Amino acid sequence: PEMVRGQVFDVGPRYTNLSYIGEGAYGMVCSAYDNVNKVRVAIKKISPFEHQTYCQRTLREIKILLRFRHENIIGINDIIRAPTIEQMKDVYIVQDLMETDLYKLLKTQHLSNDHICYFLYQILRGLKYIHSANVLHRDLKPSNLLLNTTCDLKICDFGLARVADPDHDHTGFLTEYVATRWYRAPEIMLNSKGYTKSIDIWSVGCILAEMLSNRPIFPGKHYLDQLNHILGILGSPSQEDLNCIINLKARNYLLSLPHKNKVPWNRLFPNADSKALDLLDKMLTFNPHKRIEVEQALAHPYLEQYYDPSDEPIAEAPFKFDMELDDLPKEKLKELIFEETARFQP
Ligand SMILES: O=C(CN1Cc2ccc(-c3nc(NC4CCOCC4)ncc3Cl)cc2C1=O)N1CCCc2ccccc2C1
C-alpha cells in the first residue's frame, strides 16, 4: 500500500498517486487519482473506533451526507473499509476535491462585494436545503466552507450536525458547548443547547461579517468572553429580549452589566454595501426568535441578483436518525458505521 507522512492509505486499486493535504483530530486527508472517474479526489482516512465521540462524528457525517444531494453541500463519492467488522480499523471517505476553503481565502485575499454576495448566496442556498431536512449543521465557520478555482462553494463537516429539537432547546446559564467558540450565538452561553435553526443563522451572520473585513467579528478567548464580545457590538439587550430569558442566573448576569450602546454596522464596516449590512443586522439579532430564517435571508434585497426559489431546492423528506447516538457505546457505533458503509463494497 501507499504511505503518506508515516501512515498507510489502503485505498487501491481505484485510488493512486496520493499527495498529502493535511491532518487533524479527524485523521489525515490526501488527494488521490481516481482511476474510474479520471479525476483527483479528496480521501480522508478516519480512525475513530477507540473514541466514542469520534465514532459519533463519523456516523453523523456519513448518514447525513449519503442522504443529502445538493450543489452547495459536499457529497460522499465512495467509502473504503475492510470487508469485516473485525478487520475494520479505519474508514476512508472519498469526496470531491476542493482547492481551498474560506478560512484560507480570508487570511490571504480581499473579497470584492460581488464575491461576498455570491459566497453568501451559496452558503444560504445550501443551508436552505439542510434546514428543509430538519437538520442543523451546528459548526458553520470559514474552514467548513470549501471553494474551487471558480468560487463554487460547498458546506462540509457534518460531525456535529443534529436533527432540530426546539422543544428541548432550554438549558441553564454557562452550559458547556462543543461547536467553535467564535461562531456561537449569544443564547448558547445563556439558555440554549443549540437545537434550533437560528443557531446556524447566527454563524452565517458571523461569516458574513468576517467576509466584509477579513477578521472574525467576535473572537472570544474563552467561554464567557464570547458573550461579552457579542454584547460589545450589539449593546445591552432590550427589556423585551431580556424578558425572554426566564433563567434567573442568565437574566441577572445580563442585568449586572453596565449599559452598552449598539456599535453601528456602518462604523465597523465603512466600505460595506448598505444592503449587506441590513442583512447582517438581521442575522446577528440577539433574540433567536426575531433572527431572520434562511428562506427570508435568501429573499433579502442584498441577494436579489441571485434569488430564485425555484432553483433553491429542498430535501425530499425530513431527516431522522434510526435511534439516538449520544448514549450509544463506541462498539455499537462501529456496527452502525459498518452497516452504513456496506453499499460501497463491490
Ligand atoms: O471529516 C471530518 C472533518 N473534516 C476533515 C476534512 C478534511 C478535508 C476536507 C476536504 N478538503 C478539501 N480540500 C482542502 C484542500 C486544502 O485547502 C483546504 C480545503 N476538499 C475536500 C474535502 Cl472533503 C474535509 C474535511 C472534513 O469534513 N469529520 C468526520 C470524521 C469524524 C471527526 C472526528 C474528529 C474530528 C472531526 C471529525 C469530522
Reported structure resolution in angstroms:
1.8
Q: Determine if residue 317 is labeled as part of a ligand binding site.
A: no
Residue 134 alpha carbon to ligand 1 centre in Å? 23
Q: What is the DSSP letter of 257?
A: S
Q: Do residues 66 and 313 lie in contact, with contact meaning Cβ atoms separated by under 8 Å?
A: no
- No. of helices (H) and no. of strands (E), the chain: 12, 12
Residue 315 alpha carbon to ligand 1 centre in Å? 23
The whole-angstrom separation of Cα 194 and Cα 162 is: 9
Grid-cell match 460522499, residue found: 76
Active site positions, annotated: 139
Could you tell me which of 208, 194, 190 has the C-alpha nearest to residue 160? 194
Residue 95 alpha carbon to ligand 1 centre in Å? 9
DSSP assignment of 45-100: EE--TT-HHHHHHHHHHHHHHHH---TTB----EEE--SSTTT---EEEEEE--SE
The whole-angstrom separation of Cα 222 and Cα 230 is: 13
Q: What angle do CA 294, 147, 113 make, to 5 degrees?
A: 65
Q: Angle, to 10 degrees, between the axis of helix 198-213 and the axis of helix 113-132?
A: 170
Could you tell me which of 223, 221, 217 has the C-alpha nearest to residue 263? 217
Give the contacts of 202 (CB within 8 A, at least 6 positions apart).
Answer: 183, 184, 185, 186, 283, 284, 288, 291
Pocket test of ligand 1: the residue of 146, 147, 155 to mutate, having most ligand atoms within 8 Å of its CB, is 146
Q: Determine if residue 44 is labeled as part of a ligand binding site.
A: yes
Could you tell me which of 253, 241, 245 has the C-alpha nearest to residue 286? 241
C-alpha cell at 157: 463537516
Could you tell me which of 135, 237, 145 has the C-alpha nearest to residue 186? 237
What kind of architecture, by CATH, is found in domain 98-328? Answer: Orthogonal Bundle (1.10)
The whole-angstrom separation of Cα 145 and Cα 72 is: 9
Domain ranges of the chain: 1-97+329-346, 98-328
Pick the atom of ligand 1 nearest to 96's CA: 21
Type of residue at 150: T
Pick the atom of ligand 1 nearest to 74's CA: 23
**Sign of the torsion formed by the C-alpha atoms of 111, 115, 121 and 127:** negative
Could you tell me which of 11, 148, 144 has the C-alpha nearest to residue 77? 11
Q: Give the residues surrounding ligand 1 with Cβ less than 6 Å away.
A: 21, 25-26, 29, 42, 44, 46, 48, 54, 57-58, 61, 74, 95, 97-98, 100-101, 104, 146, 156-157, 159
The whole-angstrom separation of Cα 43 and Cα 30 is: 5
Give the CATH number of domain 1-97+329-346.
3.30.200.20
Overall residue count recorded for the chain in this entry: 346
Q: How far, in whole angstroms, is CA 331 from its chain's centroid?
A: 27
